[PDB]
């Protein structure tokens, strides 16, 4: 958690969805799990700005490790999670029990 | 307002702009450079605008964005290329040969 990616969360009738803006990270390097109700989204984003940093005239993009945690309702079925990314948005879908 | 974050690097032969534009296909990001000013513009939709009341957390920014970056006179607008991966658009702007 040296940066805190934005995550929206919705509870539909029969599932939750979390949508995490994680640009610049392959969805396979993002770990999504639920442990005792806590949905965590964790990984480490690398950034070009850590390489030849002095050649940057601006560095706005955050990166490094992240670890987002959400205490989702007990209805979230922790054995149902899927996560798939497109264009740096990770969409995590979790059925309700 | 969504102000997508950008880093900009000056390499020996090129400037490189890296923009975090998650949730947009790269082909939908308009990149233009005119008068030494590199512009990125586009629009992102968000799921949060649909059935907003079912969201228990909303923080992702979306809607239109347009940022402009004046670059050194060395940058050559005509040579720009851009490629996107995982929501990051990397724009490469070559430098003009020396006068």
Q: Which two tokens stand for residue A93?
A: 């879908």
Pick the residue of A13, A18, A20, A23 with the most B CBs within 10 A to test the interface with B by mutation: A23
Cα–Cα dist A43/A59, whole Å: 21
Cα–Cα dist A60/B69, whole Å: 13
Q: How far is CA B99 from CA A82, B37, B79, in A?
A: 56, 20, 17
CATH 1.20.1630.10, domain B1-99, yes or no: no
Angle at A82 between CA A77 and CA A87, to 5 degrees: 140
**Residue A54 per-residue DSSP state:** G
Residues just before a chain gap in chain B (C–N exceeding 2.5 Å) are: none
Nearest-by-Cβ selection for A8 from B24, B59, B84: B59
Q: Taking a C-beta distance cutoff of 8 angstroms, is the pair A61, B20 a contact? A: yes
Overall residue count recorded for chain B in this entry: 99
Cα–Cα dist B87/A86, whole Å: 8
Q: What is the resolution of this structure in A?
A: 1.6
How was this structure determined? It was done by X-ray
**Residue B24 per-residue DSSP state:** S
Q: CA nearest A5: which of B44, B89, B29, B57?
A: B57
Chain A residue numbers touching B16 (CB-CB < 8 A): 48
What is A1-97's CATH topology? Immunoglobulin-like (2.60.40)
Nearest-by-Cβ selection for B60 from A8, A48, A85: A8
Q: Please answer yes or no on whether B55 and A23 come within 8 Å at the CB atom.
A: no
Domain ranges of chain A: 1-97
Cα–Cα dist A21/A4, whole Å: 10
Instruction: Give the 3-state secondary structure of residue A4.
Output: coil
Nearest-by-Cβ selection for A25 from B23, B58, B86: B86
Cα–Cα dist A36/A27, whole Å: 23
Cα–Cα dist B88/A74, whole Å: 35
**Residue A12 per-residue DSSP state:** -
Strand arrangement, sheet containing A31-35: A31-35, A38-45, A64-71
Cα–Cα dist A17/A91, whole Å: 7
Q: Please answer yes or no on whether A7 and B48 come within 8 Å at the CB atom.
A: no
């Amino acid at each position: 958690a040296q940066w805190v990616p934005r995550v929206d969360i919705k509870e539909e009738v029969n599932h939750f969805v979390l949508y995490a803006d994680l640009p610049g990270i392959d969805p396979s390097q993002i770990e999504v799990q639920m442990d005792k109700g806590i949905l965590s989204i964790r990984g480490e984003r690398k950034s070009e700005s850590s390489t030849e940093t002095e050649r940057f005239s601006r560095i706005e993009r955050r990166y490094g490790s992240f670890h987002r945690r959400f205490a989702l309702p007990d209805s979230a079925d922790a054995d149902g999670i899927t996560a798939a990314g497109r264009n740096g948005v990770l969409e995590i879908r979790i059925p309700k029990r």
